[PDB]
């Protein structure tokens, strides 16, 4: 439904929807913009990520509440039916994002900052699919997340400095994937520790604003390490 | 889309959606339940009010942000177009609620607690329509809100004690209608003061739990009076 709206107008409206905290609208404007077929700039990539993170984040929090209620009830079919409806809507949002990345954001992304950003996003949305998946397509979804994260880590370690915020946020989310999804808490702790230590040694190269950006994400790595150890 | 679901299952799902903070779902479940055609109980009336208050409250806050941005811009048509889209969606939610009340909740409501609750709701949703209305259908929408509120106040003063929470909340919202919509700050202050004073004189008749319920709303009346005087 956005094919008749100018790209620039979709971007402008996504920024208005963010101000208004209208995240489903923001995602629909940014999906529209991606579907224009042009590569996205840094600012536009961040608008796309912020919109979908907030939409799926609402769905994941609801699914958690419902899942907890369902597990306590284990009445009639209602809790299961409504948890299933929220789960399906979550899956649909993840499949939309994964489809934007496959058609055709990743294949057109040649620069490291864009290619790492989109492969981190692919890891993240398969990770949200894994949180609700049961059994053995669960395995295949977990390996798709791990593969995306690993491709992004390999490019990031060749092409970005250790304090780059996209590299830091990738490592943060890959560490969370290992602790919460892959049942690999030692890998999670090793990754978050190595990432933190390599960033700290590179901080001296930064300006004051870059230092603020990097140390913000380093504090997230530290906060997980405190929770995990 | 809820015609195939049991009434009891719609109520149960509205309570689950409230726990999950899924207010659009909660409203759609309660609309479904109303459309079964049976009168609603006290608890069910409160579920209907909580769902729509949260849905329209999100829309009103977004419309405020957008309207402020638009008034500052007075670029191209985008801010106006997106404010109009949020305004239209707000109007649609209000028209849905008003339609449930007209078809046929109010006409079947014979007891004072139900009839006052639904006429307060009718006042409230015409009040939200008035906040976004421009000119002379604006006048007619303001008079519809005032008429509904006045009918509810007349029943409430005949049939409920001055500390009844529905009577208090009606008077609170009618006072806000006079201050913010009707440009009648003196009427607003007179109503909120008379209501507060008549409730205070009736508190001695209450149990401890009823006293907690009434004094909570009295504090809201006091908070407005502090803001207005
Ligand atoms: C509204 O946004 C929501 C909603 C629900 C949520 O949990 C349900 C979360 N998650 C968090 O708050 C913390 O997650 C972290 C922490 C560090 C790195 C990556 C992540 P994530 O798992 O990609 O979000 C966010
Ligand atoms: C999310 O819920 C929202 C969203 C946006 C809001 O303003 C935009 C409000 N309003 C308020 O917080 C205070 O309003 C009062 C105060 C006293 C009596 C009646 C009302 P109301 O005007 O019926 O709500 C609530
Ligand atoms: Cl359902
Ligand atoms: Cl390429
Ligand atoms: Cl629009
Ligand atoms: Cl009747
Ligand atoms: Mg064009
Ligand atoms: Mg390219
Ligand atoms: Mg510890
Ligand atoms: Mg039946
Ligand atoms: Mg009746
Ligand atoms: Mg004062």
Swiss-Prot record, chains A, B:
Adapter protein implicated in the regulation of a large spectrum of both general and specialized signaling pathways. Binds to a large number of partners, usually by recognition of a phosphoserine or phosphothreonine motif. Binding generally results in the modulation of the activity of the binding partner. Promotes cytosolic retention of GBP1 GTPase by binding to phosphorylated GBP1, thereby inhibiting the innate immune response. Also acts as a TP53/p53-regulated inhibitor of G2/M progression. GO terms for biological process: cAMP/PKA signal transduction; establishment of skin barrier; intrinsic apoptotic signaling pathway in response to DNA damage; keratinization; keratinocyte development; keratinocyte proliferation; negative regulation of innate immune response; negative regulation of keratinocyte proliferation. The record marks 60, 127 as: Interaction with phosphoserine on interacting protein. It is found in: Cytoplasm; Nucleus; Secreted. The modification Phosphoserine is found at residue 9. One of its GO terms (molecular function) is protein kinase binding. GO terms for cellular component: cytoplasm; cytosol; extracellular exosome; extracellular space; nucleus. Keywords: Cytoplasm, Nucleus, Phosphoprotein, Secreted, Ubl conjugation. Pfam families: 14-3-3 (PF00244). The gene is SFN. The keyword Nucleotide-binding does not apply. Present mainly in tissues enriched in stratified squamous keratinizing epithelium. This is 14-3-3 protein sigma. Ubiquitinated. Ubiquitination by RFFL induces proteasomal degradation and indirectly regulates p53/TP53 activation. Its main location: cytoplasm. It comes from Homo sapiens (Human). The keyword Heme does not apply. Belongs to the 14-3-3 family. Homodimer. Interacts with KRT17 and SAMSN1. Found in a complex with XPO7, EIF4A1, ARHGAP1, VPS26A, VPS29 and VPS35. Interacts with GAB2. Interacts with SRPK2. Interacts with COPS6. Interacts with COP1; this interaction leads to proteasomal degradation. Interacts with the 'Thr-369' phosphorylated form of DAPK2. Interacts with PI4KB. Interacts with SLITRK1. Interacts with LRRK2; this interaction is dependent on LRRK2 phosphorylation.
